[PDB]
Amino acid sequence: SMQFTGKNVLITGASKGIGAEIARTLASMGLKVWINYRSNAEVADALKNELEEKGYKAAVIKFDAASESDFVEAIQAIVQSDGGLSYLVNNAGVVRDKLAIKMKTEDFHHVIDNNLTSAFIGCREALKVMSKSRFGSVVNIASIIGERGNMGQTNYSASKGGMIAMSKSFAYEGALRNIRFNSVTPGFIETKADYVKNIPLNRLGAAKEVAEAVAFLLSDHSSYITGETLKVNGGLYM
Amino acid sequence: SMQFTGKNVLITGASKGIGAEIARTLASMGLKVWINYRSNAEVADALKNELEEKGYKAAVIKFDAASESDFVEAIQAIVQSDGGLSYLVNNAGVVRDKLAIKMKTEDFHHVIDNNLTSAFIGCREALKVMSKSRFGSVVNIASIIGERGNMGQTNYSASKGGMIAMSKSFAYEGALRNIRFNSVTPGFIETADYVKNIPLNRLGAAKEVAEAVAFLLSDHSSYITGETLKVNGGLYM
Amino acid sequence: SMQFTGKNVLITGASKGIGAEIARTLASMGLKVWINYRSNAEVADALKNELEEKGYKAAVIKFDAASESDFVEAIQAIVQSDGGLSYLVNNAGVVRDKLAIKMKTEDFHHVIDNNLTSAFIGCREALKVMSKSRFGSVVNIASIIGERGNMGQTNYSASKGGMIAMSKSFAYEGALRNIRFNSVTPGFIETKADYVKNIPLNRLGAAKEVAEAVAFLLSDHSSYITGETLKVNGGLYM
Amino acid sequence: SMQFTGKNVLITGASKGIGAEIARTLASMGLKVWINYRSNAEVADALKNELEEKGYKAAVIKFDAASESDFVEAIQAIVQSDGGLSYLVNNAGVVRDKLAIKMKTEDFHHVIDNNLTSAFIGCREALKVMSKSRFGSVVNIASIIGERGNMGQTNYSASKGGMIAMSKSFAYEGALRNIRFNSVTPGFIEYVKNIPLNRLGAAKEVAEAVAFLLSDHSSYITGETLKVNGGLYM
Amino acid sequence: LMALFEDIQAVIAEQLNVDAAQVTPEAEFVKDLGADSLDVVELIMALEEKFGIEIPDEQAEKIVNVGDVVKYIEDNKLA
Amino acid sequence: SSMGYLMALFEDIQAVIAEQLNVDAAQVTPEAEFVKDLGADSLDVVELIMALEEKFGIEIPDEQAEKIVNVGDVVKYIEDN
Ligand SMILES: *P(=O)(O)OCC(C)(C)[C@H](O)C(=O)NCCC(=O)NCCSC(=O)CC(=O)CCCCC
Predict the structure, then answer these.
(1) Of A33, E50, F25, F36, which is most buried, counting CB atoms within 10 Å of its CB?
(2) Any idea which fold B8-231 has?
(3) Type and span of the H or E element at C35
C-alpha cells in the first residue's frame, strides 16, 4: 500500500484498461476516485458499482478531456462536490498508427490534438485548483506501445515526447506550490510470445503494475520527485 | 567546411535569425539553398541577393510550412526545378510564452500546430521525394526547451519535445533507404543572468547552430541517424 | 506499508545519512534489515537498537564493501543466518572532490574502487544468491552527479555514471529470473542557499524521501520496473 | 576540409582500427597526428609512413595510456616538440566480456582501471597543456559494441557510462579555458537487423564524427555524447 | 472462428503497419488501411505462405475488406 | 649568505610567476597581487600555486594557499615553513 495526504483523484479516460485499473488501485488505497468517460456510460457505471460494492469511494463524471470548456466545468463540479481536488491522472490518449507517408495531416492532428491538448488542459486546471492548498500531484500517462517494432509511430512519438516535455514545464510552474508533475511510459501491457521476445522480464505487464507506478508518483512517498518520467516496461527500454 | 553528396536543401522559415544563417552556411559550402518565407518577401529576397553576390546558389520560395497543401506543393516545385531534393531543414517555429494558467488552449494549439505539424509535413514529404534515390538527410531544429522544459513554455516545450521524439520515428522509417533524420537542440543563441549557467560563459552564435546542422546534413554524419545534437555551450548535459 | 514478497535486505554503508534512513524505512515496513558498516560500530549499534526498540528486526554486519572476499563472506553469513537474501541496496560510497588538475590518479582510483567496484560485487553476489529463488530486487544508490557531471567531481561522476550504466546490464542478466536492478539518483539531500536557488521545489531533499523511493523500487509495487534510474532531486535535473 | 584553429592532435590507441582511421582523417585535414602505440611499433610506423607519403604530418609515440607517468611524459614530449597540443582523442579502451556471475572482481577492476584511468589521465593532462592557449578540444571514444545481445557487458557498461559522466565533469572544468570535452559512442563498426541503416558502420564514419567534435565547427558543443551507431540506439 | 480472425488480423496489421484496432472485419485494405500496390502483393504472398493456399488473381481482386479474406481462408485452408 | 639566498630565491619565484601570468618580471614585485596587479584570474592562481609547488618541491595546503595573494606571500611561505 501507499500513503496519501490527499483525499481524491480524477482519472481521465478511466472506463477501461489501464484507466479502470488505476481507478481500482487508487480506490483500494483509500482515495475517492472520479471515473471520467466521454461517450458510453455503461462500462464506467459498472466500474463505479464494482468499486462501491468492494467498499470503496467512487463516482463517474462525463466530459471530453480534449474540450477546454467541458474539462474546466468537470473540475469545478468535483471541487464543488468534494471541496477540492488533490490528484489528477491524465490518461485520455488515443492511438492511430500508420506509416508517415500514408498518414494525412488530419490523422496527425487527430492524435496530437487529443493527446496533448487533453493533458495540457488537465495540468493547467490542476495548477489552478491545487495551488491554494500548497499540495498536489499530477501523473501524465503515455499510450501503451502500439505494434511490435519501430514503424508507424510518428504521431505516437510526437504525442509521447510532447507530453513528457510539457510535463517538465508544468513541473517548474507548480514547484513553488508543491504541485508535482511526472510522466509514466508503459511498455507492452496486457490490456504473444513474439512481443515477449524483446522484454527482459519475459512477460507482458499487468495493468495493475502500471497503476501501482502511477500510485507511487501520486503518493507522499515520491514527495521529492517532480519532472521525472517513470518507465514501466519490464526492461524493454532502458 | 564539409563534404556533401547531395546538391540542394530547403530550409523552412529561413528569412532571418538562425534560419537565415543556416542558409548562409550551407550556401557557402556549395549547396543550392531554397529560402522559405511566409509573409513579407523583402528580407528573404535580400538574403537571396546577399548569397548570390557572394558567389553562391540561392532561391526564395513562399509557403506556409504549417499548411499541408502549401508545403507539399513547394517541395514538388523544387523537385521539378532541380530534379530532386537532397536535404531538408525544418526550422520554422514560433514562440508564445506565458504561464499555463494564463494560456488559452488557443495559445497552445497555435504553437503546437505551427511548430510540430510543420515538421511532420516536411519529414513526411522528405520520405516521399528522397526514397527513390535512396539518399537524404533531414535536420529538425528543436531546442533545449524540448529536452528539459521551462517555466512559461508549456506550449513551446510540448512542440519541441514532440519534434525530438517524432524525428526518431522518422529515422526508423527512412533508414532502410538511407534517409537520415536528426535533431539539433540549441541553447541560448544571440539571434548575464542567462550566461551565468552556461559553462562556456557566452551565448551561442547562430553560425554555431548552422554548422551543427551542416554536419548532420553532410556526408560526415553518414552513420548517424535518430540523434539529438545539443548545441548549448554546456548549459544542459 | 508497501508490500514486500521478500523478507530481508542488506544495505551497504548504512550507519548514517541516506543509508541509515533506508534501513529505518525498510525496517518500519517489516523487513529484517542488515546494517553494514566498515570500521566504527557504535553508530550502527545505536541504529540497530533504535529499530529493535520500535519492534522492528535489525542486525549489524561489519565488512568493507570494496573488498570482494569480505563482501562475499558477509552475504554468505546472511544466507546462513536468514536462509537467503531477498533484497540488496548498494549505498556505500565516498567523495574526494578536487579540480582534476589537482587530482592524483590515486584520488581517482580511491573513489572508483570504493564506489563502483563495490556495487559490482554486490550486484554480482545478488545474482548468485537470488537466482535459485527466481526472485529479488536490487537498488543502486547513484547521484545526480552521475547524470550531469560536476566541476570538481570527475572521479565521483565517473563512479556514479558507471554505476547507473552497469546497473542496466545487471538488469538484463537478472531479468529472466525476476531479479530486478534499478538505480536512484538523489539530488542535494540534507543528511547552500545558492544550490537551493536552482531546485524547483525550493528545498533540499530529506533522506526519508530518498529512502521511500528506494523502498518503492524494492517493493512488489515496482514489479514491472527494471533497468530504470529514478531521479529524486526536486526537479534540479529533468 | 573541416576547419581547425589548432595544429596537432594525440590519438591514444592509434595503431589500428578506428584509431588508425582517426589518424588518417585528421592528417588529411591538415593536423599533425601523433600515433600512440604501446606494443607493436611496426604497424604504427607503417601508418606514419603512409601518411607522410601522402604529404601529411605524422609522428609515432610509445606509451601505456593507463600509466600515469608514461602518458604525462608523452604529452610533455609532444609539447616540447611541437610547442603545444591542440587536440586529444582518448581511444585506449579494452573489451573483456563475461557473464557477471563468471566475472572475477580482478577482471572487472582491470577493465575499468584501463578504460577509465586512461581517459582520466588524458583529460587531466589536456586541461594542463591546453589552458594557456585558452583553446582546445578533447574527444573520449567508447569501446565499440561487441555483443549481439545484452548479456556479458557489466564491465563494458561500467566503463562506457563512467567515461560519459566523467567527460561531462571535465567539460565544466575545461569550459573556463574554452577547452571542450565530448564523447563518441560507436555502434557496430566493422544483429544487423537491429540496425536501422541495415549495415555495419565504417571506421571512417566514426573518425569523421570525431573530427567534427575536434573541429571549429562544433565550437559551442561541450558535454555532449554523440552516438555513431546507425540508429541502433536513439 | 475468432482464433483464425486474430491470427489473420495480426498478419494484416504487421504487413500494413497499422495498429490492430484498425483491422476490423469491415476495414478495406486500400481505402481504410492504406495498402498500395506492393503492399497488396506482399500481403497476398504472406497469407499464401502462412496458410498454404493460392488465391486466383480474379478472386483476390474481389477481397475488399478484412472479413472477406478471413472468409476466403476458412473456406480454402486445410483442416 | 642569507641575503644571497633571498636574492636567488626571489629570482626563481619571479621567473615562475612571470611565465605563468605572462607578465614582465619587473612587474613581479613583492607587493604585486596576482589578480589585481598581474592580470590573473582565479584558475591562474591555482595553476600558479601548482607551478610553484613542483619547482620548489612543497605541498601548500588549500587552506594555506587561499591566503597567498601577492608575490611576497609566496616568498615568505617558501622561506618559512
Ligand atoms: P497499383 O499502384 O498498381 O494499384 C493501385 C490501383 C491502380 C489498383 C488503384 O488503387 C485502384 O485502382 N482501385 C482501388 C479499388 C479497388 O480495387 N479496391 C479493392 C482493392 S484490391 C484488394 O483489396 C485485394 C487485396 O488487397 C486483398 C489483400 C490480400 C489478402 C487476400
Answers:
(1) A33
(2) Rossmann fold (3.40.50)
(3) strand C32-37
- In terms of phi and psi (left: phi > 0; alpha: psi -120 to 50; beta: otherwise), the region of A183 is beta
Q: What whole-number distance in Å separates Cα of residue D21 and Cα of residue D165?
A: 26
What is the C-alpha to C-alpha distance for residues C91 and C103, in angstroms, rounded to an integer? 24
Which residues are paired to B11 by β-bridges? B35, B89
Q: What is the dihedral of CA B223, C170, C132, D148, to 10 degrees?
A: 20
Resolution (angstroms) stands at 1.8
Query: How far is A76 from A83, CA to CA, in rounded Å?
Result: 10
Number of domains in chain E: 1
Fold topology of D8-228:
Rossmann fold (3.40.50)
Please give the Cα distance from A211 to A214 (Å, whole number). 5
CB B214 within 8 A of CB D217: yes
Q: Does C238 touch chain B (CB under 8 A)?
A: yes
Helix (H) or strand (E) holding B183: strand B179-186
- Per CB-CB distance under 8 Å, the chain C contacts of A175 are 200-202, 234-235
Q: Does domain A8-232 have CATH number 3.40.50.720?
A: yes
Cell of D217: 565547427
Q: Is the dihedral of CA C154, A171, C21, C120 positive or negative?
A: negative
d(CA A143, CA D194): 24
Cα dihedral value A218, A224, A230, A232, nearest 10: -60
- Range list of β-strands (E), D38-164: 58-62, 87-90, 136-141
Angle CA A170–A171–A174, to nearest 5 = 80
Of E73, E76, E78, E60, nearest in space to E9 by CA? E73
CA-E38 nearest atom, ligand 1: 1
Report the CATH number at residue E21: 1.10.1200.10
State the residue range of the domain holding E38. 2-76
| Contact list, A159 vs chain B (CB under 8 Å) | 162
Query: Which residues are within 8 A (CB) of A139 and not within 5 positions of it... i.e. 6 or more apart?
Result: A88, A89, A90, A182, A183, A184, A214, A217, A218
Q: Strands across the sheet with B136-141, in order?
A: B58-62, B32-37, B8-11, B87-90, B136-141, B179-186, B228-231
- C-alpha cell, D132: 594557456
How much distance in Å is there from the Cα of B117 to the middle of ligand 1?
30
C-alpha A178 chain-centroid distance: 20
Question: C167 with C181: CB under 8 angstroms?
Answer: yes
- The phi-psi region of residue B200 (left if phi > 0; otherwise alpha if psi is between -120 and 50; otherwise beta) is alpha
**For the purposes of burial, counting CB atoms within 10 Å of the CB of B132, is it exposed (0-12), middle (13-18) or buried (19 or more)?**
exposed
Measured distance CA(C40)–CA(C64) in Å, rounded: 12
Region class of A118: left (phi > 0), else alpha (psi between -120 and 50), else beta:
alpha
Q: What angle do CA E66, E71, E77 make, to 5 degrees?
A: 120
Cα A206 to its chain centre, rounded Å, is 16
* CA distances in angstroms from C195 to B193, B225, C17, C203, C205, listed in the order given: 16, 37, 19, 9, 12
HSE, CB side, 13 Å, CA atoms: give it for residue C18. 28
Residue E16 in contact with residue E33, Cβ under 8 Å?
A: yes
Q: Are A209 and A232 in contact (CB under 8 A)?
A: yes
Ligand 1: residue of E63, E68, E74 to mutate (most ligand atoms within 8 A of CB) is E63
Instruction: Let me know if C156 is a catalytic residue.
Output: yes
The whole-angstrom distance between F9's CA and the closest CA on chain C is 25
CB neighbours (10 Å) of residue A33?
A: 28
Q: Count the neighbouring beta carbons within 10 Å of the beta carbon of residue B87.
A: 29
